[PDB]
Design a protein around this ligand. Structure first.
Ligand SMILES: N=C(N)NCCC[C@H](NCC(=O)OP(=O)(O)OC[C@H]1O[C@@H](n2cnc3c(N)ncnc32)[C@H](O)[C@@H]1O)C(=O)O
Ligand SMILES: [Mg+2]
Ligand SMILES: [Mg+2]
Length: 496
């Protein structure tokens, strides 16, 4: 529903001397008071949004300009540490007020879904939220610093930056790691990176009672922060405990709930989803996308996510299509995505030792996948947020000892028990089922391959070659997905 962030993404630059995005929306070039020596930036955002709130300026320290894509959820908290009074008019101004107090350490305090770039004097700051849910890339050269929330905008011509990965194929284009802040001196072109968050490695113990309660309270608040007062949110659900947990909380926070479920002509989860829409009495809508169409949208998913990971792509393909086929006006969409990462729910492990090993490195290897990028939905005009990856909910879920994740013969137990009084028993105890499984994405994507020659002891690697190809063409090539024929790229790869 209405009330989206002041901005979805952006392209900025800071020099001593027309961007094309996947994100759909309006563009607004911000003013440049000191012109040449100011921070130039093109903002991409909803046509019904006033970019203002995403831009803030000041003279504190120096001439300072701040651009912020996304939103912050722990506003009251952040506002409580400041000299109360001149409340900022937005998140960008909020960030600026915080930077004046804690400097770059301010980002250690922010709980949100954002990406920002700030310039003060010849100093340039680049930051992401604890999870890096709003991809942020950069080209740093002595005297020139280009920032963008999409690598495709920076894929034309920087110098190597340490503590930052290079974007596949591109050269001189880096990504700002998750939960980090790059301190950049425009003069020398030097960049220092500070991490402002890192998964916890220790585990805490708690009796079922307290554990189930803390997990519920946290989730409820994570959702409360994400739902806008007034309009009814939209929840994309499966009729999994994850998205059902979220639907339950959102329903309470908004008093009403619109839901939507995706399916293909091979399989779907409409029955599991219906069992939830009926319990909660939500306004439901089932969308079925032909497997052929599903696969035909491969280049769009890779173009929006800017990822080259085959498996993640299979997870996003169904979701991406669903966002694109969504009917009606731009919505504020909540999800239950990510819940499995801190729970190892995608591994189906009954052995605590293996469960901890698995859930752990999973937390240490999510950066760079962009699975939770907002572009997956903003390419269609929809804003998405994921409450399970809220910093507070993530911290807690991650910290729980394996015996609370795998317990009583069930996985993700703690969460299942946390929602047992708001969802039907069949739902709470429904076995884990990937979006890419309950729709036949992974299976279908293996025919189109096998149906082109590639045999067994290859298939996975082949998908990896197709996905990498789509990337080079769209992200690193300037080619719109609609110009890349999936079946063509598949053919050129069905070889070796
Ligand atoms: N980096 C890692 N190591 N982890 C990767 C694994 C990530 C994992 N995502 C894959 C996964 O199995 O999805 P899964 O937990 O099934 O699916 C993800 C989320 O997508 C939405 N969703 C799923 N199926 C549908 C459907 N049919 N219609 C509408 N919305 C739907 C739901 O809101 C749900 O909470 C997850 O944790 O969400
Ligand atoms: Mg899940
Ligand atoms: Mg599922």
């Amino acid at each position: 529903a209405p009330v989206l962030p002041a901005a979805f993404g952006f392209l900025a630059s800071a020099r001593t001397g027309g961007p094309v995005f996947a994100t759909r929306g309006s563009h607004t070039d911000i003013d440049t008071p000191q012109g040449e020596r100011s921070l130039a930036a093109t903002l991409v955002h909803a046509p019904s949004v006033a970019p203002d709130r995403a831009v803030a300026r000041s003279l504190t320290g120096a001439p300072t300009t701040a651009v912020l894509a996304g939103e912050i959820y722990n506003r009251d908290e952040l506002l409580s540490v400041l000299p109360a009074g001149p409340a900022p008019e937005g998140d960008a101004e909020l960030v600026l007020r915080l930077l004046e107090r804690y400097d770059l350490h301010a980002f250690r305090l922010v709980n949100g879904r954002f990406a920002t770039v700030v310039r003060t004097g010849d100093r340039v700051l680049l930051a992401t939220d604890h999870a890096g849910s709003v991809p942020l890339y950069t080209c740093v050269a002595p005297g020139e610093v280009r920032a963008s929330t999409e690598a495709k905008a920076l894929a034309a011509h920087g110098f190597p930056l340490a503590d930052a990965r290079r974007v596949a194929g591109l050269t001189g284009v880096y990504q700002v790691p998750a939960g980090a802040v790059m301190d950049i001196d425009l003069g020398s072109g030097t960049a220092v990176t500070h991490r402002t968050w890192t998964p916890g490695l220790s585990r805490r113990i708690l009796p079922e009672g307290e554990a189930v309660a803390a997990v519920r309270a946290a989730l409820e608040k994570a959702v409360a922060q994400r739902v806008t007062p007034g309009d009814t949110p939209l929840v994309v659900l499966s009729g999994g405990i994850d998205s059902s947990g979220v639907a339950a909380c959102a329903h309470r926070a908004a008093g009403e709930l619109d839901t939507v479920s995706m399916g293909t002509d091979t399989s779907n989860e409409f029955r599991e989803a219906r069992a939830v829409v009926d319990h909660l009495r939500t306004r439901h809508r089932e969308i079925t996308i032909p497997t052929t169409e599903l696969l035909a949208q491969l280049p769009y998913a890779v173009w929006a996510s800017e990822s080259v990971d085959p498996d993640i792509i299979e997870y996003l393909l169904p979701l991406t299509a669903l966002y694109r086929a969504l009917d009606g006006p731009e919505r504020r969409i909540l999800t239950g995505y990510g819940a499995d990462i801190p729970l190892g729910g995608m591994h189906r492990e009954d052995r605590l030792p293996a469960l901890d090993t698995v859930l752990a490195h999973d937390m240490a290897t999510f950066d760079g996948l962009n699975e939770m990028s907002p572009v997956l939905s903003t390419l269609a005009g929809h804003w998405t947020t994921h409450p399970y990856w809220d910093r507070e909910v993530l911290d807690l879920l991650v910290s729980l000892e394996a015996g609370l994740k795998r317990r009583h013969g069930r996985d993700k137990w703690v969460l299942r028990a946390a929602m047992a009084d708001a969802l039907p028993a069949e739902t709470v105890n429904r076995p884990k089922l990937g979006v890419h499984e309950g729709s036949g994405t992974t299976s279908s994507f293996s025919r189109l391959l096998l149906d082109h020659g590639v045999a067994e002891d290859r298939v996975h690697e082949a998908k990896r070659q197709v996905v990498r190809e789509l990337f080079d063409l769209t992200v690193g090539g300037g080619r719109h997905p609609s110009e890349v024929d999936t079946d063509d790229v598949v053919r050129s790869v069905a070889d070796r």
